[PDB]
Amino acid sequence: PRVELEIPEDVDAEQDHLDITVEGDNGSVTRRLWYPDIDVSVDGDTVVIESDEDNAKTMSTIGTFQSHIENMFHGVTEGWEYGMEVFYSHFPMQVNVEGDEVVIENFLGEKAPRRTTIHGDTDVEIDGEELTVSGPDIEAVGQTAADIEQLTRINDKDVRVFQDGVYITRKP
Amino acid sequence: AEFDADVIVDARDCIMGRVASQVAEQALDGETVAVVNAERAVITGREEQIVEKYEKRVDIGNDNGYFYPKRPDGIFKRTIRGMLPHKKQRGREAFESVRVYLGNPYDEDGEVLDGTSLDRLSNIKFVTLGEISETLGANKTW
Amino acid sequence: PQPSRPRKGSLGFGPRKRSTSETPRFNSWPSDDGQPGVQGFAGYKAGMTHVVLVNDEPNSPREGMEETVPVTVIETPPMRAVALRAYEDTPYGQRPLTEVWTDEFHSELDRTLDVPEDHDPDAAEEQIRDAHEAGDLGDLRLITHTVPDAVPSVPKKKPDVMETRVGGGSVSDRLDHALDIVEDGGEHAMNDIFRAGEYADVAGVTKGKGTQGPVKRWGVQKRKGKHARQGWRRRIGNLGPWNPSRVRSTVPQQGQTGYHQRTELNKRLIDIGEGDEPTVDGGFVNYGEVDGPYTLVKGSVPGPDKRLVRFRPAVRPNDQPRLDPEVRYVSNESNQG
Amino acid sequence: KPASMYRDIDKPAYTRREYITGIPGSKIAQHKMGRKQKDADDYPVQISLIVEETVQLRHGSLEASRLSANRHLIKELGEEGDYKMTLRKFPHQVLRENKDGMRAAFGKIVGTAARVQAGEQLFTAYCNVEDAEHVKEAFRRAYNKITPSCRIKVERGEEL
Amino acid sequence: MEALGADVTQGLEKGSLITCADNTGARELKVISVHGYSGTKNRLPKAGLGDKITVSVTKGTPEMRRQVLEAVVVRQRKPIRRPDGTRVKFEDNAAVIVDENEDPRGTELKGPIAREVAQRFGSVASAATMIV
RNA sequence: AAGCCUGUGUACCAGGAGGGGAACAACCCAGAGAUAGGUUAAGGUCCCCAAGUGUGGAUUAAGUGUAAUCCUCUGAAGGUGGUCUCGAGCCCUAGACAGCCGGGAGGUGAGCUUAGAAGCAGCUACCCUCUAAGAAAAGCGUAACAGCUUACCGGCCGAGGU
RNA sequence: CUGUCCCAACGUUGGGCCCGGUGAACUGUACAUUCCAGUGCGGAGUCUGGAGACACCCAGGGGGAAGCAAAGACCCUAUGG
RNA sequence: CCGAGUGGCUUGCUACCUCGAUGUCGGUUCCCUCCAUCCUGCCCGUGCAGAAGCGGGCAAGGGUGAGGUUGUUCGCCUAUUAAAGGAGGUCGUGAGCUGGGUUUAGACCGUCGUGAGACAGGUCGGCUGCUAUCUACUGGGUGUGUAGGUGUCUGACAAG
RNA sequence: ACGCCACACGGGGUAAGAGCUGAACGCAUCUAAGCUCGAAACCCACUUGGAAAAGAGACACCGCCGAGGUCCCGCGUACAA
Ligand SMILES: CC[C@H]1OC(=O)[C@H](C)[C@@H](O[C@H]2C[C@@](C)(OC)[C@@H](O)[C@H](C)O2)[C@H](C)[C@@H](O[C@@H]2O[C@H](C)C[C@H](N(C)C)[C@H]2O)[C@](C)(O)C[C@@H](C)CN(C)[C@H](C)[C@@H](O)[C@]1(C)O
Ligand SMILES: [Cl-]
Ligand SMILES: [Cl-]
Ligand SMILES: [Cl-]
Ligand SMILES: [Cl-]
Ligand SMILES: [Cl-]
Ligand SMILES: [Cl-]
Ligand SMILES: [Cl-]
Ligand SMILES: [K+]
Ligand SMILES: [Mg+2]
Ligand SMILES: [Mg+2]
Ligand SMILES: [Mg+2]
Ligand SMILES: [Mg+2]
Ligand SMILES: [Mg+2]
Ligand SMILES: [Mg+2]
Ligand SMILES: [Mg+2]
Ligand SMILES: [Mg+2]
Ligand SMILES: [Mg+2]
Ligand SMILES: [Mg+2]
Ligand SMILES: [Mg+2]
Ligand SMILES: [Mg+2]
Ligand SMILES: [Mg+2]
Ligand SMILES: [Mg+2]
Ligand SMILES: [Mg+2]
Ligand SMILES: [Mg+2]
């Protein structure tokens, strides 16, 4: 099979070997698209994903590569953003960005600061009880958002009563 | 330290077992063989089960001993030994006229033996000898 | 149902054989951080005493109070880095590339080595720098030796030679740092490397006890009660089960005990001085009188009096350093009595 | 006692009651279920449970499977739902157990079983197109209580 | 437990008979167990100055005899080492009966107590006539 | 149940070599004077190891498997949108399947029961208007309302879907 | 009451170890540097597959040689005592 | 309930191996192992507020102890404990120990027998050989190989 | 020894598990390719042995008519020979 993705005018995509790079006004993203017998190439104004095989496993990856590339198109132009709300009940939670990692202090009254490093060129902006994670690589951004929510995970006690933590409010 | 090899084989991206099989045959026919870029030789399959097999070989042993190599260096050398009657005169002579190297210490580039090369564009389930050695705990000296 | 019980002795210090070199050989070095510097030193064990110290630990309820502490006195005269050996990184690990020697040699270094009469320091140095350009230079170390002659209590004059790694800033800088030391005469002291209050790892060849049985050597029980009168007193029950039909090397058996190399971790240096402040009245038993450069190590040190011991900056410290501890008293009371 | 002991047909047929005494009663409560006053022809759908391997099924298993199947039909169609089910096999084969070692080993009588050849109908139910999926569910529960793997086959019925 | 501020060589074992240094009515106490202790094969469980032990009353008033109670070791003959190096030893082995909250069951303590025990059990110490 | 016990017919071991089966009384080839050349049998042809890294085609991703027979080689009932292949029925460019947007309206909060019950406690009935649709309501939700959606209709999309 | 034990230590005498002299016995189908598995009359240093293995010598405690020692004293059998 | 299995710890069955002998039970001492996990680590569910639990998953690194009766294994009981898990190694281990039980020769009691005497009943007493040839391992030497010496190292592997 | 001293942290990769991106199947989906995490367990770290590693190693200096070694002698930080 073969699928043709016309690259946006705002964007220009180059590719060597199994690596594809996508650059736009919002940045650039490089990925590796390696799977048996699937050739990904840049044919002038379009990206081509093709293979001589058409079995379920091959069709699966082809459809997967497409979305990965379309997501890259969207990332280098409009960008990707996740919104988060920091909710707490008894202990005022302090969420700050320090260096290349977001730190959370006084979670549930804990003396030790919980933290996590930010993935890639992802940007985390905090304004009160609202957080916004954004960047060109949906992979990196999506993880950073998730990691922040995971950062306040609690297994010891009943989550229904202890609901403190930062949650994903808006998904792109 | 210098090895007058009548043949220099490049294992890069080549199926270890298939190369070994041919290198054994040649050493038994009087050829002095040198396998190069061992760290880049490859073996097909699911990495997790492959590693389990080689890890088991490391754990096995006792006082008598079962010394199994961890470096891609010896893994390949041992693979070859298993295809030679190394305890017989003729067999030990052949095995001893075969050496494996990390990278290529020669000026010539090795040759690729027919039917031993693997196509990375058609295969995703395979592993590198070097990757196995790192997993085994070897000190990446290559 | 036969209660559980840990085995007798550790399986990590074997085989329990006589050591090859009476001079200890570190098998690991500190990490490269601060400025370049020799990562070790050596001295000769003299004996023990105790010192009264002011509790240093900031987390101790006794902080600031008098505290008695055991101390092993080690004579640490100046040593001499006589050469700079360079290692190159190869597919088979590290290998010595070349060495840069000097001209100034101790009058009796020829009791152990065939001292150099003709050498080319720059030729060697050049080969090293070319290697560094190529990016094949492995760590850098100094050939070092002691001056037993400076220690009256030790009968030997024949110097003990060991190699000590040099760690530091950039390789270029520590390389230069090394060459400087050597060129001079190599003469350096405990001061140059250690400061009282830091933690050092001490290595040494333990006291020898010749052949000893399983009880003493491995810590197995003696026969008990009625069993102790039947003809067996200090022999283990059996050498193993019916199967496997062989004796495993893990069963505690007789053999050489002592005179093994040991590396004791995190030994606190209580004080580095010089003179005779630590000497005991009557003299250290089986040793003599201390009156020169010395070091006070907290606690015990492997080896008998007179043996060579090696110091190294702790490679795995647990506590932060509390420099120059206040020593309010050093006992000089006779050790005979 | 495990069925492994009696599931195979590795012994002569042993059914002659004129030469066998003290045979335990059957645990099978009924062979005709549902509305036994009605005919099988009065139904559009007819589904049978077919045994895929030749075997012996102890009366204890027949009852357990017959039970778990009809018990489901009751729960889903009511104690009088419009359906009828039949267990067509009867446990004729008498079973022994040797419970002195191998001396005079001929076993004492301990039970009865039915011999079923592969491809035979053990159970056959008749229902309306609506209750077709309910009878299929009763059989699924039934074949989980007899030794062999089975096929739930729809004989009279094509509303698919 | 809270550090003692002194090194101890346990001088007692399971089964040892010791003095009950109080006015509870129990004169002799038999050591049965050591709170928080876990030994090793063949090792007779040991207790020393400062430990909380379970005990049975061997000698004393009828009401007290045969009772299984908790207690605190206050004195022992085997030496203990203090921070300044000096060793400290007593004339006998003694313990004081205690309740769930570690308060002495009796009203008065007989004989001297070790200062180290005071650190651990304050209410016990604040009943001591002498503290050495 | 047994490498169990006890029959029966037969071939074999015993008393049967040699070839094969890793080894191995009775499994396969094979019944054998000596010596010599040749061709096969069982079995095998990537190396160890004589002969193929043989050809056309397909499947498998688990190292499944590379294990005729067997005390010896396990693998079961039950389950599987892992994947490949074949058949039947129905829907679909008069636009299907799914997703997204929009609409989801009135008589009337049906009657009854009830202080109240207004799709949704229970009982009965389950009717007709506007219209391109829209139940006397399929599932949550409320003290009861509210609220959120399923059915149902319209658009966007565009090719197979079930 | 105590080293029976916790829990072992040091010491004493005679051996043990090295040297001169004296100088046996048990045991021996052969071969034999083995180890892990397998196989086999079902409990192999010797068969099969691998692994390991440079030779000789000293001291040791006894895991294996289904170790050495005695034609099983249990059990059954004998037209035995 | 019924149905399907895995293990080879119990018991039973069989009679293949040894009757010109493969030393018993229990205990002890010393070594290795298995996981069907008692504790410890990391997790999932809860009839999960918390605390304390109950159930389940990965997981064998380490730990799993001291005592009273009994020859006991097993088991009962006590106080401690994070917990005081189970099993294999000729039911590991007598050319290592012990010798309390079973099971010689002495004796008593009960039951049986005309009796000698018997008991899958109880009870008191009642023996533990050998100088290691080979192999195995723990430690110590002498030689040869690598191919003049001194000193310093490297690290394939190996152990925890 | 009954006395005294010392015996990590941290990295890397995983299991169960928590997730991200994501298709087969326009949706959904932690999984099919890819990825972020995550056990006292695995690897590294750390300690001990280790030129007989038969690819039997490296470096520096001394020496081949003399470097060095053995015997001898006085002794032990060593030791049954
Ligand atoms: C103290 C010295 C004596 O030594 C003994 O008494 C031993 C402890 C004795 O042992 C004693 C003591 C004891 C407890 O066994 C250790 C007992 O069961 C036997 C019967 O007698 C041995 C082990 C017996 O040999 C054993 O004979 C058993 C019947 C079978 C067993 N093996 C094969 C299972 C076997 O080793 C044996 C039958 O005596 C061996 C026979 C070859 C030679 N004897 C006759 C000699 C002359 C001995 O008398 C002796 C050397 O003078
Ligand atoms: Cl090994
Ligand atoms: Cl061979
Ligand atoms: Cl692949
Ligand atoms: Cl003992
Ligand atoms: Cl206790
Ligand atoms: Cl014939
Ligand atoms: Cl494999
Ligand atoms: K016998
Ligand atoms: Mg809780
Ligand atoms: Mg003294
Ligand atoms: Mg004094
Ligand atoms: Mg005990
Ligand atoms: Mg015959
Ligand atoms: Mg060939
Ligand atoms: Mg397989
Ligand atoms: Mg006989
Ligand atoms: Mg008899
Ligand atoms: Mg024997
Ligand atoms: Mg498990
Ligand atoms: Mg273990
Ligand atoms: Mg046994
Ligand atoms: Mg034995
Ligand atoms: Mg014996
Ligand atoms: Mg003996």
Ligand SMILES: [Mg+2]
């Ligand atoms: Mg008795």
Ligand SMILES: [Mg+2]
């Ligand atoms: Mg008796």
Ligand code: NA
């Ligand atoms: Na492979």
Ligand code: NA
């Ligand atoms: Na190994």
Ligand code: NA
């Ligand atoms: Na004796």
Ligand code: NA
């Ligand atoms: Na034995």
Ligand code: NA
């Ligand atoms: Na009978």
Ligand code: NA
């Ligand atoms: Na014949």
Ligand code: NA
């Ligand atoms: Na054969």
Ligand code: NA
């Ligand atoms: Na396989």
Ligand code: NA
């Ligand atoms: Na004594």
Ligand code: NA
């Ligand atoms: Na032996």
Ligand code: NA
């Ligand atoms: Na079974």
Ligand code: NA
């Ligand atoms: Na025993």
Ligand code: NA
């Ligand atoms: Na464990």
Ligand code: NA
């Ligand atoms: Na008991």
